[PDB]
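User: I'm designing a mutation panel for 26S proteasome non-ATPase regulatory subunit 12 and want to avoid disrupting the core. Could you give me a predicted structure to guide residue selection? Please restate the sequence first so the numbering is unambiguous.

Assistant: Good idea. Sequence first, for numbering, then the predicted structure tokens:
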Amino acid sequence: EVDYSATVDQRLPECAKLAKEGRLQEVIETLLSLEKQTRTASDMVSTSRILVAVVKMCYEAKEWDLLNENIMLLSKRRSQLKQAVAKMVQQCCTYVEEITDLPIKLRLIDTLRMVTEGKIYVEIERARLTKTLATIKEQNGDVKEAASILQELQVETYGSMEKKERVEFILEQMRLCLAVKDYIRTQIISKKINTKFFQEENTEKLKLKYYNLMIQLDQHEGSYLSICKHYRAIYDTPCIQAESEKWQQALKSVVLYVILAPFDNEQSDLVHRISGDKKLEEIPKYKDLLKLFTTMELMRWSTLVEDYGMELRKGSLESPATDVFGSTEEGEKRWKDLKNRVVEHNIRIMAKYYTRITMKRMAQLLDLSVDESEAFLSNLVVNKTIFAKVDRLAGIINFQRPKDPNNLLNDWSQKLNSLMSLVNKTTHLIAKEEMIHN
């Protein structure tokens, strides 16, 4: 357009000197007139410098009220250039960072966040400023208010923000929600992160923070399998997989949580996947333990305790123990759940092999009293986990379902089919033997 350029180059140092002398209101009025001229001229580079010089002038002179009023007026000028306001806010957030006085900084943050509300070109600043506000509202107590302030920011919609900073914002939102114990909101916010982003270049810190936050979230609910998956995701990070003290702990937690997960197709598949790892040999006590949950035999709770409890609960100096079975309340609950998993595995094995078993023998093999074993079996039967009929009068447990004539005759027919196939295969093998020795 008219390209003022040097016109503001002449003015700005002069008004800066006058401001240092003490004249500000007249000087800021002169810059208001010059800003009007540039804005009508639509000179982006001149208007941005004018606004930046104005806010710097009101900042260096400690004119906090004047700075806030100038920000309000300059942001609200008619047909203001958006980039000029963006540069002005970018310069003002630096002053926000520099200011250490809490009330002045808070008022300046409020003004900046109210002038940048609902505007795309300053969405990043109002984001970062909000983060700063949240920090101020957390280091001074009142974590609930900081969580509420950072929660309303829909950072996933902010297109200009870098994906890395967006993920950092979501992680901070999740951490604040966890700090106020808002696990439902933590799940809702966790849904906003695509885990594939952690397969990219150097962002392993974000991956570790995200998966630790998810571990904390799922620990409260008790979803052991999800916790095991999260720990397995931590185990695959190159940073953790490069230090023994880190990947060993991660894999210890992986094993201890895949064991705690109730048996299903997914749990068995995960156990098989983990057992294929060779790094388990660096921690045999855990590896053998996993083998104990893979073998199709009875395992005794007393033997399991006397062989692994010290290595799991108290641990060793050479191999530190995870917090999975620590002395805290969560550790005690996980220990009880481990005993439940052991007895349930024993009941599964006893259902595969036994057809009928005495309640006394079942209690003896479960390291439980008759009443405790019967209650556990009843709980399993009601949940349709394991079929069993308890003739309590005779103290008998029947794992054998009544034989449908369809089922019996189908077993007979399957035997016939296998017999015929084996006869054919034997005939072919006989033909090969005839060929070889003729």
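For picking mutation sites, this is relevant: The first helix runs from residue 6 to 21. DSSP finds 20 helices and three strands in the chain.
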